[PDB]
Automatic annotation (TrEMBL), chain A:
GO biological process, one term: adaptive immune response
Annotated membrane topology: Single-pass type I membrane protein
Compartment(s) where it occurs, according to its Swiss-Prot or TrEMBL record: Endosome membrane; Lysosome membrane
Glycosylated sites: 16
Alphabetic keyword roster: Adaptive immunity, Disulfide bond, Endosome, Glycoprotein, Immunity, Lysosome, Membrane, MHC II, Signal, Transmembrane, Transmembrane helix
GO cellular component assignments: endosome membrane; lysosomal membrane; MHC class II protein complex
Disulphide connectivity of cysteines: 12-76, 104-160
Record's protein name: MHC class II HLA-DQ-beta-1
Major place of residence: membrane
TrEMBL record, chain C:
Glycosylated sites: 80, 120
S-S bridge residues: 109-165
High-level lineage: Eukaryota, Metazoa, Chordata, Craniata, Vertebrata
Organism per entry: Homo sapiens (Human)
Domain of life: Eukaryota
Stated name of the protein: MHC class II HLA-DQ-alpha chain
GO cellular component, one term: lysosomal membrane
Entire protein: shown range: 2 to 184 of 227
Ranges where the Ig-like domain occurs: 89-169
Keywords attached to this entry: Adaptive immunity, Disulfide bond, Endosome, Glycoprotein, Immunity, Lysosome, Membrane, MHC II, Signal, Transmembrane, Transmembrane helix
Length: 177, 15, 183
């Protein structure tokens, strides 16, 4: 079939809390951004030759230009204060298992900050450690899989140390032959 | 009781 | 890309002419906080935490979709009716937890690079279609303005089961059957 798509993306970029906030609204036709308001730029700007008509019309109207600049406060800064009350306090502790070629599965944790260290006896393993990228589960939880590419000797103890903002103490799980 | 807002998109002037 | 601690999508507005459909959702750091049922006119938050503390009037969503519906007709004429190009979607299937036979789990089917935002995600057990224990996310935005969607299947791992995720897209010549083995 023949389809035509339009997208509008009001994006807010936060750095160092609310010290550095930036608003970028995006007007997209199919997969092409043709116009855009960036709060750093201050006015609408065409991105492709498809957007000079919209950008010049929106900039000429004083009431449109003020309501878009005020969105940095009414939308970006205002909603962030509600994020600090809910989303930014979410703390889901990770479940950590080890299973056979040895994988330290770290599942169902949030936020995204994570740190996985493999230990061979008393020596932290720093070479043969293949870590998959952070896997977003889409239900406000993450998981990650970290492999240790050596299990040569019997009598050696292999431990996995996981650090997360939800844990006051790291999680340690051990495996033996 | 703060109601969240979104970004209101501008309207093109074609018809 | 742009460097920031947190990226917020306070207005993922979408409208397309195929079977006139639209979508409105707010995202924070890659996760959907809510969407609006446009026909039911209801905000549907994605976490029990948000239903308790957060409010969004669904009327504002309906206003924006009407504006996107308007702009689309304008830009369609300015572009000489340049239709969207169908992208090839990528599918991956994995479990939420390590699979222990007997312990409840959930299978996750991630479809990525979806454009246009029209897709069928369906689960099957081993020979019959699975309708129970199936949930799906809304279309989630990406930087390059494509979409990705995730479907879930709550199941109980057993020995006589190998599950498949069926993805139907226009950019695919044939339906994609992604495979997951308990072993
Ligand atoms: C999705 O399924 C519907 C029937 O439920 C079908 O009409 C539509 O063409 C399908 N979409 C595809 C194959 O992209």
């Amino acid at each position: 079939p023949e389809d035509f798509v339009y997208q509008f993306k009001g994006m807010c970029y936060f750095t160092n809390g609310t010290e550095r906030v930036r608003l970028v609204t995006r007007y997209i036709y199919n997969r092409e951004e043709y116009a855009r308001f960036d709060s750093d730029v201050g006015v609408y700007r065409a991105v492709t030759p498809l957007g000079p008509p919209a950008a010049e019309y929106w900039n000429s109207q004083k009431e449109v230009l003020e309501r878009t600049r005020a969105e940095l406060d009414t939308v970006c800064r205002h909603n962030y204060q509600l994020e600090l009350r809910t989303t930014l306090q979410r703390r889901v502790e990770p479940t950590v298992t080890i299973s056979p070629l040895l994988v330290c599965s770290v599942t169902d944790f949030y936020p995204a900050q994570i740190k996985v260290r493999w230990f061979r006896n008393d020596q932290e393993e720093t070479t043969g450690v293949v870590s998959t990228p952070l896997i977003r589960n889409g239900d406000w939880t993450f998981q990650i899989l970290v492999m240790l590419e050596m299990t040569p000797q019997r009598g050696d103890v292999y431990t996995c140390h996981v650090e997360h903002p939800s844990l006051q103490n790291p999680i340690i799980v051990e495996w033996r032959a | 009781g703060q109601v969240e807002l979104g970004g209101g998109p501008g309207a093109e002037s074609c018809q | 890309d742009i460097v920031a601690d947190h990226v917020a999508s306070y207005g993922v507005n979408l409208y397309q002419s195929y079977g006139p459909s639209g979508q409105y959702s707010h995202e924070f750091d890659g996760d959907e906080e809510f969407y609006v049922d446009l026909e039911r006119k209801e905000t549907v938050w994605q976490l029990p935490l948000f239903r308790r503390f957060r409010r969004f009037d669904p009327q504002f969503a309906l206003t924006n979709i009407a504006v996107l519906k308007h702009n689309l007709n304008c830009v369609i004429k300015r572009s000489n009716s340049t239709a969207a190009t169908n992208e090839v979607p990528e599918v991956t299937v994995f479990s939420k937890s390590p699979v222990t036979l007997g312990q409840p789990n959930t299978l996750i089917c991630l479809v990525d690079n979806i454009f246009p935002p029209v897709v069928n995600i369906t689960w099957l057990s081993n020979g019959h279609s699975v309708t129970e224990g199936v949930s799906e996310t809304s279309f989630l935005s990406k930087s390059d303005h494509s979409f990705f969607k995730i479907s879930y299947l709550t199941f109980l791992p057993s020995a006589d089961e190998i599950y498949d995720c069926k993805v139907e897209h226009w950019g695919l010549d044939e339906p994609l059957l992604k495979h997951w083995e308990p072993e």
